[PDB]
Amino acid sequence: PPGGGEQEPPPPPAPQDVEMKEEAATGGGSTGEADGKTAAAAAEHSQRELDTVTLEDIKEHVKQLEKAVSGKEPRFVLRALRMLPSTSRRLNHYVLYKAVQGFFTSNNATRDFLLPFLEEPMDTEADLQFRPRTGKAASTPLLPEVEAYLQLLVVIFMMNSKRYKEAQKISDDLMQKISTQNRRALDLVAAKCYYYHARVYEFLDKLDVVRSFLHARLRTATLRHDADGQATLLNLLLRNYLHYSLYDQAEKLVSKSVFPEQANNNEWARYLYYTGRIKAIQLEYSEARRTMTNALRKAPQHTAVGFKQTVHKLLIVVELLLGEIPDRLQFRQPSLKRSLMPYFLLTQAVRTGNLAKFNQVLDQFGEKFQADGTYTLIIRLRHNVIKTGVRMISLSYSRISLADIAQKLQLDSPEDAEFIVAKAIRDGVIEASINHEKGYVQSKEMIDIYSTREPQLAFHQRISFCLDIHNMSVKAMRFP
Amino acid sequence: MSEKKQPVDEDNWDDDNVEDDFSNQLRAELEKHGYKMETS
Amino acid sequence: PKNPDLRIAQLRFLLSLPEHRGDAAVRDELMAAVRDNNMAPYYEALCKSLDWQIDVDLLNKMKKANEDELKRLDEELEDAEKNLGESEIRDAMMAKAEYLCRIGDKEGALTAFRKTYDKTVALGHRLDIVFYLLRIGLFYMDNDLITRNTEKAKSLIEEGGDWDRRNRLKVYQGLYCVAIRDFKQAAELFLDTVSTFTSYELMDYKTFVTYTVYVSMIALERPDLREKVIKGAEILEVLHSLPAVRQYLFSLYECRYSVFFQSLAVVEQEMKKDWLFAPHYRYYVREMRIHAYSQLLESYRSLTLGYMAEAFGVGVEFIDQELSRFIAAGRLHCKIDKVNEIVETNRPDSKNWQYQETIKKGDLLLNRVQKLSRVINM
Amino acid sequence: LEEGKAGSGLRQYYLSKIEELQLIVNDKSQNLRRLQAQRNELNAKVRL
Amino acid sequence: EQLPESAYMHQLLGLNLLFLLSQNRVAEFHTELERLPAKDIQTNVYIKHPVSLEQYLMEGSYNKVFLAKGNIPAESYTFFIDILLD
Numbered sequence A: 001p002p003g004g005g006e007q008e009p010p011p012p013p014a015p016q017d018v019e020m021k022e023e024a025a026t027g028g029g030s031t032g033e034a035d036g037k038t039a040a041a042a043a044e045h046s047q048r049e050l051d052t053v054t055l056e057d058i059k060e061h062v063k064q065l066e067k068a069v070s071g072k073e074p075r076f077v078l079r080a081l082r083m084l085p086s087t088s089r090r091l092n093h094y095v096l097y098k099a100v101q102g103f104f105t106s107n108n109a110t111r112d113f114l115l116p117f118l119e120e121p122m123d124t125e126a127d128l129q130f131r132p133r134t135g136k137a138a139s140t141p142l143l144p145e146v147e148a149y150l151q152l153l154v155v156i157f158m159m160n161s162k163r164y165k166e167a168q169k170i171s172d173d174l175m176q177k178i179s180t181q182n183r184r185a186l187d188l189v190a191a192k193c194y195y196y197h198a199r200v201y202e203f204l205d206k207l208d209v210v211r212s213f214l215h216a217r218l219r220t221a222t223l224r225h226d227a228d229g230q231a232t233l234l235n236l237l238l239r240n241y242l243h244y245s246l247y248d249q250a251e252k253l254v255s256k257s258v259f260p261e262q263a264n265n266n267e268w269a270r271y272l273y274y275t276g277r278i279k280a281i282q283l284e285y286s287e288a289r290r291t292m293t294n295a296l297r298k299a300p301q302h303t304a305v306g307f308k309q310t311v312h313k314l315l316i317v318v319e320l321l322l323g324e325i326p327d328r329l330q331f332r333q334p335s336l337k338r339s340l341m342p343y344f345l346l347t348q349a350v351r352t353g354n355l356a357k358f359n360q361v362l363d364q365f366g367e368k369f370q371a372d373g374t375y376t377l378i379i380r381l382r383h384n385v386i387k388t389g390v391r392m393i394s395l396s397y398s399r400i401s402l403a404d405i406a407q408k409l410q411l412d413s414p415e416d417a418e419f420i421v422a423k424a425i426r427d428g429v430i431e432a433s434i435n436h437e438k439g440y441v442q443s444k445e446m447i448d449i450y451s452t453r454e455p456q457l458a459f460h461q462r463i464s465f466c467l468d469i470h471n472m473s474v475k476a477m478r479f480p
Numbered sequence B: 001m002s003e004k005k006q007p008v009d010e011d012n013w014d015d016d017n018v019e020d021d022f023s024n025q026l027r028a029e030l031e032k033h034g035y036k037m038e039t040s
Numbered sequence C: 001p002k003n004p005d006l007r008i009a010q011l012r013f014l015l016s017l018p019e020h021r022g023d024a025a026v027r028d029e030l031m032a033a034v035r036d037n038n039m040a041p042y043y044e045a046l047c048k049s050l051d052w053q054i055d056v057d058l059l060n061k062m063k064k065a066n067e068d069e070l071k072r073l074d075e076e077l078e079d080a081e082k083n084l085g086e087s088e089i090r091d092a093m094m095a096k097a098e099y100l101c102r103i104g105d106k107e108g109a110l111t112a113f114r115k116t117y118d119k120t121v122a123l124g125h126r127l128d129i130v131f132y133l134l135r136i137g138l139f140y141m142d143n144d145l146i147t148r149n150t151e152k153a154k155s156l157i158e159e160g161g162d163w164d165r166r167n168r169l170k171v172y173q174g175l176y177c178v179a180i181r182d183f184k185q186a187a188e189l190f191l192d193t194v195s196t197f198t199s200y201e202l203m204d205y206k207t208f209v210t211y212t213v214y215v216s217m218i219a220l221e222r223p224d225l226r227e228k229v230i231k232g233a234e235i236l237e238v239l240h241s242l243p244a245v246r247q248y249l250f251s252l253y254e255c256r257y258s259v260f261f262q263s264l265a266v267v268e269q270e271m272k273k274d275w276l277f278a279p280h281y282r283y284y285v286r287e288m289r290i291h292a293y294s295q296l297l298e299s300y301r302s303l304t305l306g307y308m309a310e311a312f313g314v315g316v317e318f319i320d321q322e323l324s325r326f327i328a329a330g331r332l333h334c335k336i337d338k339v340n341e342i343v344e345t346n347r348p349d350s351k352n353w354q355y356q357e358t359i360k361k362g363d364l365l366l367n368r369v370q371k372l373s374r375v376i377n378m
Numbered sequence D: 001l002e003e004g005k006a007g008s009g010l011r012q013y014y015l016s017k018i019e020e021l022q023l024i025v026n027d028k029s030q031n032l033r034r035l036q037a038q039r040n041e042l043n044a045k046v047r048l
Numbered sequence E: 001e002q003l004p005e006s007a008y009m010h011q012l013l014g015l016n017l018l019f020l021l022s023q024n025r026v027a028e029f030h031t032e033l034e035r036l037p038a039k040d041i042q043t044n045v046y047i048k049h050p051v052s053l054e055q056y057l058m059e060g061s062y063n064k065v066f067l068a069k070g071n072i073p074a075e076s077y078t079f080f081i082d083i084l085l086d
Helices: A002-006 A015-035 A044-056 A074-076 A085-094 A098-102 A112-125 A131-137 A142-150 A155-174 A181-202 A211-221 A230-241 A265-281 A285-296 A307-313 A318-320 A336-351 A355-373 A373-395 A404-406 A416-426 A454-478 B011-022 B032-040 C003-016 C023-034 C041-048 C055-079 C094-102 C107-115 C123-139 C144-158 C166-178 C184-196 C205-217 C224-230 C236-242 C243-254 C261-274 C281-297 C305-312 C318-328 C354-376 D007-047 E010-022 E026-037 E045-057 E063-068 E080-085
Strands: C336-337 C342-344
Touching: A015 A044, A015 A074, A015 A085, A015 A098, A015 A131, A015 A181, A044 A181, A074 A112, A074 C205, A085 C094, A112 A131, A112 A155, A112 C224, A142 A181, A211 C107, A211 C123, A211 C261, A230 A265, A265 A318, A265 E080, A285 A318, A285 C354, A307 A336, A307 D007, A318 A336, A318 A373, A318 C236, A336 A355, A336 A373, A336 B011, A373 A404, A373 A416, A373 C318, A373 C336, A373 E045, A404 A416, A416 C055, A454 C354, A454 D007, B011 C281, B032 C261, C003 C023, C003 C055, C003 C107, C003 C123, C023 C041, C023 C055, C055 C094, C094 C107, C107 C123, C107 E080, C144 C166, C166 C184, C166 C205, C184 C205, C184 C236, C205 C236, C205 C243, C205 C261, C224 C236, C224 C243, C243 C261, C243 C281, C281 C318, C305 C318, E010 E026, E010 E045, E010 E080, E026 E045, E045 E063
Parallel strands: none
Antiparallel strands: C336 C342
């Protein structure tokens, strides 16, 4: 007891130091940043908030544990008050209550008592200015607390957060409206909480009404104030409207627009993966392979760990339907390895045309595919592999006989081979002529693609791609 | 990233890309290509 | 002080793939147990080979005499440190006590490596460390310890020159280049040849000639393949002593494909029965084929495979799927006509496809600076 | 007011949005004004 | 989503499914099965016939379809298999 008793006091000062100065330096700093300039936004503290919340989402959040009473949530949410420069006294009173945890017997004011606490910035009379700071006070205590996931009676407090922070949404739409620049700072905060909206419902029931409530904030951001706001709302749509039926696939046509400009960076990179799985159910491979490839190369920085790895797993799924794929272990990660083992040997059976090997993969490894929901392709991927097998042979040989390729690709009969080659010509896969007597297939080398034709015509898209980046560099140069 | 539902749900490894093409095709192979000597 | 125990690692792979002889490999292993005071070499071989009967007191009076020889070196640490001298006191507790790693397990290894590491004022003693890390990583297949010590060996000992132990490093990484997959630097670091001469860590130099000649038939191109052997002085006499290797070397330049499938199997026999070549022989097979098939299809624009049946003796359906599985993997792109008995050459890589490396590698390049351009600012 | 002081702010927001947009375009001009005066001084350097 | 089980629900999901296969549209074919997509291959043999029927159209069939046209529950598919002919 004396050994562990003396080690209890030291830690809580650590949240009283860094976690204090988290919203003391940033929040007190963003005060003057959100009072003016306010260009854009920027307000880089809102992006610095991405380097805090996501950092806090591991440690320490607000709590924790660490060996405190979880009294940081009531501390900053009380006594806002605020006014002219005496707001420093509020930060000074935040230092005064630090000794309360270390001296007296500490008491936990979270949970049940957090209901009037979120009303206090309104009850302090008055805020009087920044809702994003109170939105932060209605989120950063509660939303990182959602990671506990105890599911008992505190989920309605997570809903009470989504209630009183919807009262912040009431102050979001009603207040300002003219050169706000807090909404663009809130578009990062409103995004997150709307993400936590979707997350909290997934543990109880998927949201039917919030789907209607999503289009509310969706449509109302147009055209008055929209920067990055509708994109994050469109991400909420395509995320869940994918996993749940129906008709949401073709919905992307009337929504886009794009919506420009893509923000922020990797945030829009995953969006191409979302519509990527969509366009995969449209059966169009070519537009799906370019949006999936662009989804990996445009996505920084990780780690950790498998969040980027699992999304990359199902990303190369469109490559299984392309018909041209290499062995995917070049994309393997030691952490993703154990999870991709049932999905690994799959593509290894795609490179071969054996039915007994391909069907054995579906039987044993089909259990892993149930969680992915990828069973739509397994019926049409049989027709994809037979195109890869015939392309391997047709590219390796000038002439290929139907009887020799019959059992080599084990089509087993001459009649269905005439049906496959016919549809292969219909799809433009093979140029082979066929001489029908028994019959047999006699092809010839295809040429004249040459030099003067394809490379210089493709270079029209290459330079038009490059000369636009010259403007992209100038536009990016004009901001500094 | 880590937002949205991302978190919700030489070496021999480099040669293993090509090495697995040996597993499903033509083994390595010595014995079979060594048996083809006296076949014809 | 390696080859007697370095051959126990040869005995491990001799036990590993073939199961035929368990007595012949355990007799010289026990003969290596009754000398050199080997303990774990026969303990890890006790699971692979037979579990006797009894070793025990026969080899326990050894590990006791080892312990007597171990304690007298452990008595030498406080007896010599009673006096004072530079590096001389604690130099006796490295080479012979890391020779006790040769006795057994890693206990001699790990505790005698770092214990003597801080004192040594000479780079030769620090490399004897790296030496004994390379043998234990050869004995036990673990690849970790032999990668790191060589990295420590290149920084300190190369400062700086040496003739003797530095040429061994080029052999070690060259042996590591053939341990993992590197063709080009394997024979490149093996260019030293007789300058290393023969050493306990170089085993039999004639076998080192076999290691460098098998990588030199791929990585060393045909103009340079005949050059290094014919123009190279010291390397030419050792290959002429072996009629099997020298034949296949000149027959490769002679282009006859009738003796290849025979002689290449003889090389594959050595490639099958040698350690560290087990993962690497699979791609080695058809890489020497395309090496012989490179010059093959370059000869004629239209070639009949019946004329290939002559040289192959007789390829009919064998090269049908063989050469087809070469094209699918991107090796030697060519067009071979089926049932028409015609091979077409091609592919004119001097113009069209050779341009594609510009933009393709330049796509992800410029894409990487597109995304990272939107980061600045924000 | 209802026309109004709630709507006019949104009207004033458009101008302030364009003012910040213009300031962004101005910030693109301001640093570009330096590239002129620099080379304009360099145009005096060849005359120097 | 909680509703009592019905009877005719089975084949009518297939009636519009096979009628839409007769008009050659591939897109709306699989999206109609998205009501229970995970259980398509797992259960509901009434859904298993069209997904195996489309498999034979890629063979093509012709032959295998008419052999499977010998035994069908169906039910009511008789009108649509005549348009599947044309």
